[PDB]
Design a binder for these strands. Structure first.
Lengths: 134, 259, 158
RNA sequence: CGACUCUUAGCGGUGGAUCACUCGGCUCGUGCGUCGAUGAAGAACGCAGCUAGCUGCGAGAAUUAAUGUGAAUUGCAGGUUGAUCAUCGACACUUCGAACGCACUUGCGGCCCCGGGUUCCUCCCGGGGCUACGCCUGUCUGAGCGUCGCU
RNA sequence: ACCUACUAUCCAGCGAAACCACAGCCAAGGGAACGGGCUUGGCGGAAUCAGCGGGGAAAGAAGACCCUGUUGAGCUUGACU
RNA sequence: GGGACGCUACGCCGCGACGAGUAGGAGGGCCGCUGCGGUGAGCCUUGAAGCCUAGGGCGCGGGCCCGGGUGGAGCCGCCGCAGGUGCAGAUCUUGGUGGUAGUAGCAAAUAUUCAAACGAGAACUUUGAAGGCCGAAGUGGAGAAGGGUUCCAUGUGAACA
RNA sequence: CGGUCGUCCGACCUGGGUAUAGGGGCGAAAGACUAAUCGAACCAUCUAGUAGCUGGUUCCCUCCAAAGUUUCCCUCAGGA
RNA sequence: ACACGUGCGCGAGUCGGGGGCUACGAAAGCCGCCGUGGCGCAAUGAAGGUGAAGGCCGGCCGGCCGAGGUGGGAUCCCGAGGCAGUCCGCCGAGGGCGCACCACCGGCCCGUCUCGCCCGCCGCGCCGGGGAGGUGGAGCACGAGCGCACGUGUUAGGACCC
RNA sequence: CGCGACCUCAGAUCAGACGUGGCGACCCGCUGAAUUUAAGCAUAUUAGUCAGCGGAGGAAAAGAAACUAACCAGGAUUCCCUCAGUAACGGCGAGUGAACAGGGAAGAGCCCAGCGCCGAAUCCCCGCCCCGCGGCGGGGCGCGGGAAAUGUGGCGUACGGAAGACCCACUCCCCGGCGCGGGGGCCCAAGUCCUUCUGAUCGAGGCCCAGCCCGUGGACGGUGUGAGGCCGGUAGCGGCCCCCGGCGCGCCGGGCCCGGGUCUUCCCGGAGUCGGGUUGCUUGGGAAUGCAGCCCAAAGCGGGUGGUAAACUCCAUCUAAGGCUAAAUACCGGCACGAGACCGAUAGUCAACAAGUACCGUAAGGGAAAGUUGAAAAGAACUUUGAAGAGAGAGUUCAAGAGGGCGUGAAACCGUUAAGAGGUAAACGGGUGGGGUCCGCGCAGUCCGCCCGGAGGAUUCAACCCGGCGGCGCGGUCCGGCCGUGCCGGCGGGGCGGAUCCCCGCUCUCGGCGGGGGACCGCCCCCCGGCCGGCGACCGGCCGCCGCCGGGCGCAUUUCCACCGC
């Protein structure tokens, strides 16, 4: 159960927030878990994805162990585009197939001044549950 | 339904003649809704017959003695093994149906302790039955915040709260109830009686003070005693073949005399 | 059109009563609002009693009720004059005062004076400043034992 | 067997009935409970690279600044010392509109001050600040064979 | 009685509406007192075209002529207020 | 002094008599719809609801269960609860479709014909010629009110003419 | 709409502006006109006005089963 | 809102519905020194007001019996009898206590009419009251209502729909 | 006349400010019907109602008695229950219809005029200083101006107040400055683990000894059907970072010398106002309840009220004709929320969508219809006919039988294929018959028990021994526990209750009063003890009997399996 009286549990209202979320909220919804090798090193469960991140596909028709990078993040479709995840058009051109960020695991990140700042901050409060909780 | 529904339109019947059906109709206009029929429950749009009001008698009041009577009947039927089986509870491995547990479980603060307690008491099979009963609801309730339904589980009754509510509320089917504040809606779900109940030691001893015995009234109610029985020996099979009746009976006639 | 046997009834529904219909769905929410404001008031006057100032012993008019005793609006000036309490100082120490009340009897006048005498004994008065306790305040040990009184202060039992 | 016509079934046309879906209504409850001459509500007209409507905005015109956030927007081209979103406390806000120079033609003014125009010399042009009613205190200028006082 | 123009006729093209319980051959009988359906008889044969006004108590509009309503309106007066 | 069935007792069994029906009344529905509390360790992408069906059936009946096809995501049985719960009509409302019917009709103001160009396609477009009409109170040339891009060039024959 | 008609120098016709607004206007007078509406215009509301008067009133089975008669009512198409 | 019938809890009582205290929960539980108040427990009269059995014995007083009767009354009780000789149970002519309820005759309470004899006090009369016989009351005569729910019927509401 | 005050009255684009309008769900003050009912209708009722007008606020209004009552008296206003469908009004008809008291929510009181005392002791503006300056605030200086004696400020308001004398008592309250939880933002647990389906899994099985792991987190939503562990989230008195005034401390600029009791002397109240007559409206208010127009028009041991008009006489209760004031209360408008036994595109707001939009009327105004491809456009490349619209191949998809108004695609209606039939319009009920349609998966027709036969094959029967379990017992009454919706006893104890009978305190050491004993009685619980009953709404051990199971033997004329006779 949820106990916060100001937190919505309505189905129609929750779908309204999801489909009409602003762009800075759209990035937060598009978070994907890190690969298992990253997970002990950074102590971070999941993370929003950016334009240049190495991606394995876990579910769907394009799942496998192949390593591909993101092409662009299409926040209007809840869709990201991966390098070699693409299908053949009729005329001979190639079209990138959209994969939802939920069926995405990140094997390598895109380190930055603002990217690195979240890593200790997400790993800070991750530890706090192990001093206060213990 | 809103009281302005079907009444915001301005309409007037065309009267007799004009080969129309005398219904009030929309006053003019170069649109589809023009002379189309506004009022009446038979027409498209407009008011429906007998609009529901907010002042319908939603609530009902019950006598205090009758409210306390069903709780006594609900508690008494929870100690008979045959009635609880008819509620579907999978508790055939429970050692004693009046399940009385020590007062140490109030100090529980983790759900893993509560799960292990149910495994040790062999009541986990009813919670395991709850998992098999989880399915999305039939009908229009799925889009009205009633998407998922599940079976009732065992009810845990505690005298005092020291963390037992926190450690038990995450297990589905588990419903917590205070001793002084009982509820017939959670002791007899659906109107049927005989829900599986789990009691603590202080919970099990406080029942003699909230309702009393037949020779001593309740110490926490102002004026309340246990109701009397209409009949005492309810097993009429023992009564019917008892010797005292059997003398003053005629010979049974069981020879079939057809036409 | 009446039936065979029945009453003659006068239903007062010939006005436009459906517009003026007062539902009572606010009642469960109103009770919470009354309780929360009452609890918030008590914390504002945390040493003072939650009921408020004391009420006098009052006989009823309307001979139907003339054998009953209630709690009144305030103590009369004659009752305060005998008790030796100034009318402008009694209101600061939690005594209900009104100048409208009379004193035709002596038993009720003496009952409220006796009621005022036991209130002055039970009243723990804090000093104006904690640095300088004055003459008419309570002892220092009574400061540590000052507690809120739940319910009506000195309930009037018939 | 014919052509035509009747019944039933299959398939194909018209049609959107039924079902399942819902960023919408309806009802109830809680907190707050705030408009304007420092120009309200409302209306008109304009503003995007390609934009008819909707939405947003006001010549700084699908927004300026600041803060939070942190690698996009996207239908198509274009270009980390902060793109985009949200917050919004600074700045700005065309014309009517209580609407305020007179009227509502968008026409005519009046006063003061600046720049070309003078070389203040009258103009002309452009720009900036004022010019609605009633009323309160106070100031100034006044009226009265109203009541007087001193020459 | 005859002549002319535009229709009506047919064809190329485009193309509705009113109306429609089911639909439509009659004699007599009875019936709610004038039947397409019922009874007894006369009888009866695909699909149609151009006219035609006998019938469908034909289509048009909950009869305005008459009466009732304790339903109204315009008007008049020696009706009531 | 070693042995058939039975008995949801709101169940089972045996005797006799009776069975019309408008208005109207009552009772029984394991008749039907929707949602809620229980309940079926219920059904379900190895196929839910809905729909069609020359199949097998059940019940006097309201209706219901299987077989086949389509369909792609929910649904039902039992115990109680509650209702905006069952249509053939109301010159009912909304929407759709028929016979009429390829029918009435495309008939007010004298009239069009030939050749060439273009085009896939010409009675209706363009050019030339012929024959006509409006006959200056015009079927001519410009205004006001009103219309508001209808005015001009190019292109189209999707919708209208 | 066609033919046939009355008048066509004055009580003639007509454009624009303006004034008279509903129990009111205006009327060479017809109960005529007042935006296809006139023996009281149009829009919205009271209003879902009332109707002893017409029309309709939705699943099955079983059981029982009528009355158009008394009296009274401004009662006679209705009620008690 | 009312009437009747039915089901439930309590019972001469019954009830919080208004108010306080302790996700579902706006639920549920608790508070009668929170039962104020609603209905019933007493009616009658316009009102002032009044306001619900008697008998016997002894000499208006003192003791006793003390809650009406008759007929019909489902059920229960006895046993003349009968299923060498006792117990159980059976039934049984006949004899009784009689539930509810019906009919009748009485008795008591309030108003009214008529007729009297009287007594008596805190203020002795135009005073206060009793008695007897008729009559009117929606009365008494060993309670039955309260609260909730359901169904039907009549209404006021838009009121089966146009 | 000159000159100078003062009173009235003007002018300002004078200096500084104020009002206009909108919304209007709730509130206040006016105005204000007719539909309807009375089976007609006129008083009534609808109804102080709809409509119209003005004015605000976050609440408004009302509000601290010229009150209610007749009691042993209560004591501001507002709201709920009750009073009560009552008193009362009403062609006394339909109908209308309060108030007191009581229980609750809340509870806060006060200020003027006048009477008088203080030397106008008062206030506004302008200029200067100091300090904060988005509310120009305070204090100081003004022979700076003005208002005010046609009355400002302090004391002071019916509960009395003012002055003087006598006692008592603390002298410290309050403005403009500074330094010492709410709102917002960012994050925090655990499987995408093995097999298996699907186009995709969130579908199925498993993950033993931690029946995977987390759970104070198994609400919800999204992700290619159904997910606690994929993600956002959720839980948490969880973590981190900012803003807000706050609560109290300290410093200074500060005003700040204050009252209560006794005695004496004084003083003190609101005018075309109350009230009366009349008229109209209204109310339950009835010989006017309330409001309003006109006329008359007051008084001070006075005036008002005491629900029938009046006179006389006792009382009872307040002090009108001046004003302020939060809380309980209402809220179909607005801001931001949470929720639903509600409805599901002819439903639900008119409007789920470029909806008050398209469109209509000169105008006031009227006012629609309209959701769904697919998981992802992967939206059909390319070839060919046709001028093209449109096709035929090919291709995408799980599926084009989802191909751009595209999910599912019913009926009316139409086209085509198959079958049957066809001069009394068609259609229907009963009874057959014929033909199709698929089905029975029928095509050699039942098996089940008991007995016999012979072929076989077992580790096999009965009876004994051991162990466990269960049932019953009238064990005629074995022994012990536990309970009583059983009773009795008590040099018993407690906890209570009682409408049974010494001490602490107060208003007049004894008499009165409230509270606490103690004793007595009654109930409950416990220590027990004695009976009764039970363990079949509820029990154990020993003994006896019986049954079952497991293991040893017993070992084949016993027992159990398999096969056929027609």
């Amino acid at each position: 159960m949820k106990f916060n009286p100001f937190v919505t549990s309505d189905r129609s209202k929750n779908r309204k927030r999801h489909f009409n979320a602003p762009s800075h909220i759209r990035r937060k919804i598009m978070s994907s878990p890190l690969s298992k090798e990253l997970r002990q090193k950074y102590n971070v469960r999941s993370m929003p994805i950016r334009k240049d991140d190495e991606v394995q596909v876990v579910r769907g028709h394009y799942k496998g162990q192949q390593i591909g990078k993101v092409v662009q993040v299409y926040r209007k479709k809840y869709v990201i585009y991966i390098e070699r995840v693409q299908r053949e058009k009729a005329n001979g051109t190639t079209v990138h197939v959209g994969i939802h960020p939920s069926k995405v695991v990140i094997t390598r990140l895109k380190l930055d001044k603002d990217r690195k700042k979240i890593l200790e901050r997400k790993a800070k409060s991750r530890q706090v549950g192990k001093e206060k909780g213990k | 339904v809103s009281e302005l529904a079907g009444h915001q339109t301005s309409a007037e019947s065309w009267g007799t003649g004009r080969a129309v059906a005398r219904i009030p109709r929309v006053r003019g206009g170069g649109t589809h809704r023009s002379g189309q029929g506004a009022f009446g429950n038979m027409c498209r749009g407009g008011r429906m017959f007998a609009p529901t009001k907010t002042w319908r008698r939603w609530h009902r009041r019950v006598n205090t003695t009758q409210k306390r009577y069903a709780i006594c009947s609900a508690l008494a039927a929870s100690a008979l093994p045959a009635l609880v089986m008819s509620k579907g509870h999978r508790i055939e491995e429970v050692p004693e149906l009046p399940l009385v547990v020590e007062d140490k479980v109030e100090g529980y603060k983790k759900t893993k302790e509560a799960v292990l307690l149910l495994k040790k008491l062999k009541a986990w099979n009813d919670i395991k039955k709850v998992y098999a009963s989880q399915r999305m609801r039939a009908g229009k309730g799925k889009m009205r915040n009633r998407r998922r339904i599940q079976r009732r589980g065992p009810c845990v009754i505690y005298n005092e709260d020291n963390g037992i509510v926190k450690a038990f509320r995450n297990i589905p089917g588990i419903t917590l109830l205070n001793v002084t504040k009982l509820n017939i809606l959670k002791l007899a779900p659906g109107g049927h009686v005989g829900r599986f109940c789990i009691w603590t030691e202080s919970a099990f001893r406080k029942l003699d003070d909230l309702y009393g015995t037949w020779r001593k009234a309740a110490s926490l109610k102002s004026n309340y005693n246990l109701p009397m029985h209409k009949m005492l020996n309810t097993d009429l099979s023992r009564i019917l073949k008892s010797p005292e009746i059997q003398r003053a009976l005629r010979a049974p006639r069981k020879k079939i005399h057809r036409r | 059109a009446p039936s065979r046997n029945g009453m003659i009834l006068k239903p007062h529904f010939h006005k436009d009563w459906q517009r003026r219909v007062a539902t009572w769905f606010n009642q469960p929410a109103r009770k919470i609002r009354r309780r929360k404001a009452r609890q918030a008031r008590a914390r504002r006057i945390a040493p003072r009693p939650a009921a408020g100032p004391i009420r006098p012993i009052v006989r009823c008019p309307t001979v139907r009720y003339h054998t009953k005793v209630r709690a009144g609006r305030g103590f009369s000036l004659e009752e305060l004059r005998v008790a030796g309490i100034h009318k402008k100082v009694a209101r600061t120490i939690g005594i209900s005062v009104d100048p409208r009340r009379r004193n035709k009897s002596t038993e009720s006048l003496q009952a409220n004076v006796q009621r005022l005498k036991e209130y002055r004994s039970k009243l723990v008065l804090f000093p104006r400043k904690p640095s300088a306790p004055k003459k008419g305040d309570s002892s220092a040990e009574e400061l540590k034992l000052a507690t809120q009184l739940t319910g009506p202060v000195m309930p009037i039992r018939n």
